[PDB]
């Protein structure tokens, strides 16, 4: 769903 380069933390 989210952008792969978005915040994963």
């Amino acid at each position, epitope marked *: 769903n989210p952008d792969p*380069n*978005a915040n*994963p*933390n």
Partner: antibody
Amino acid sequence: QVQLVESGGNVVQPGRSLRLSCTASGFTFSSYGMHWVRQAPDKGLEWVAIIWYDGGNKFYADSVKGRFTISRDNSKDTLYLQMNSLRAEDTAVYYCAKAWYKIDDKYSMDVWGQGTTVTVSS
Amino acid sequence: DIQMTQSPSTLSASVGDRVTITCRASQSISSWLAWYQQKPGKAPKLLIYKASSLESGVPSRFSGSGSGTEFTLTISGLQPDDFATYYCQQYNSYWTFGQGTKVEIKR
């Protein structure tokens, strides 16, 4: 200081499986996403997979889709990479890297582990 | 995908020189570019993030510059600890690295 220790690298025959590990210390593991990156002279540095802090969202490089499965156990501070039906071109040093927290729109990785060696051969 | 290409592949310089490593992108990545350093047998080390921001604990002799498709990593006053390989990495769409640039001792 952030500490990432990879484990599980070994000689594996083509078509077989192998699971790597990455135990972390020196920070709160459950708070960060994690990457897998492999290095070999034929591929240079090649990104493998990323997983969110909670283990939900996962992404993979195209060449490993359907064969590699990334997961994490936050109660153990361990990151895993399940590699199935391994091929000769999967031979490399595999790094786990912590996602960074430079607050912006796009994110990457800052601290890498020491790596673990996977040799796919019969 | 977005392919990175560094230049040159191997650079020869001496201590105290100003060296320049160039990274080129296949499409516009704005300023989402990171620079890493790697020494033989060791892991990569983050040097520059967002094209020009210096990672904490990194000497001031490292400077980053660039935008869009062309980027440059400059090391003013080269020191013995700097002889290593330098990679660029875009993080605009997934993560892809350049082939690497080895800085060697000139003689």
